[PDB]
């Protein structure tokens, strides 16, 4: 692709009897978090979470903090409205999540924008790819849709995604270029773990890679072993990089028929590995 993304992820959660709903936001460029805000912080403020954003001046942090405080209030009204749209009790805890942002290509041009919401973990409403129209999941979301149509909300959302979001993403990519534009390839190896006299596990490891997107596959005699491969979810190491493994159970003596194939944007060419007994 050469492409990049910026995303904001908001979570509001009600907690009847335990105060007003908590609002959390995090911002990402690609797989790198760069800001947070938490309404339960002793002094809620947007805070930097990557080195390259620390250079933004006080006006940045002050503006953004005001935006999140207003957003938290709007989300509290949204949660009240949603409880009513679903005929729900005031006794229960409910969750509103929102995700929005933009994708750009290597030249900085908009590829697409996103602006969508979920209620209790279920898709609720989304801005369509055209940035003009909405898709509502159910008759409750159709209320929101009618209100947002009447107010021409999508126009403001389009303007943000095509203007602000792309312009600030481009700035972040320039300021963070040494890390955000650097792919770190996986360090790979294969381990062997006897299970019984007649079978063993071959585990293909990928360590230390960024971004998180990777493909690890095993082949037997050149045929992909999809149903027989155990994959773990890609996981963060805590130093910006990610880890993953894929395993297969193989008959004793047949190890050399199996190859692990690794694809990652940090690799000029995909890797083929095998178990190397010493």
């Amino acid at each position: 692709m050469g492409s990049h993304s910026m995303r904001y992820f908001y979570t509001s959660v009600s907690r009847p009897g335990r105060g007003e709903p908590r609002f959390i936001s995090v911002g990402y460029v690609d797989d790198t978090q760069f800001v947070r805000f938490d309404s339960d912080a002793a002094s809620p403020r947007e805070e930097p979470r990557a080195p390259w954003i620390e250079q933004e001046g006080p006006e940045y942090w002050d503006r953004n903090t005001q935006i999140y405080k207003a957003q938290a209030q709007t989300d509290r009204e949204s949660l009240r409205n949603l409880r009513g749209y679903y005929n729900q009790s005031e006794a229960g805890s409910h969750t509103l999540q929102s995700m929005y942002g933009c994708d750009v290509g290597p030249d900085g041009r908009l590829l697409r924008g996103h602006n969508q919401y979920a209620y209790d973990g279920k898709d609720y409403i989304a801005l369509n790819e055209d940035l003009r129209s909405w898709t509502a999941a159910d008759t409750a979301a159709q209320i929101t849709q009618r209100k947002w149509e009447a107010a021409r909300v999508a126009e403001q959302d389009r303007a943000y995604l095509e203007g602000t979001c792309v312009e600030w993403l481009r700035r972040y990519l320039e300021n963070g270029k040494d890390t955000l534009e650097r792919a770190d390839p996986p360090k790979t190896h294969v381990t062997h773990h006897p299970i019984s006299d007649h079978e063993a596990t071959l585990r293909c490891w990928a360590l230390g890679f960024y971004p998180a997107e990777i493909t690890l596959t095993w082949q037997r005699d050149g045929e992909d072993q999809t149903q027989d491969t155990e994959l773990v979810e890609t996981r963060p190491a805590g130093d910006r990089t990610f880890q993953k493994w894929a395993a297969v159970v193989v008959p004793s003596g047949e190890e050399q028929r199996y190859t692990c194939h690794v694809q990652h944007e940090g690799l000029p060419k995909p890797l083929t590995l095998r178990w190397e007994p010493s």
């Binding site: 207003a70 949603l82 509103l96 409403i125 943000y160 600030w168």
Partner: peptide
């Protein structure tokens, strides 16, 4: 930078 002036659902 986040979006300003969002509307309630």
């Amino acid at each position: 930078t986040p979006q300003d002036l969002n509307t309630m659902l």
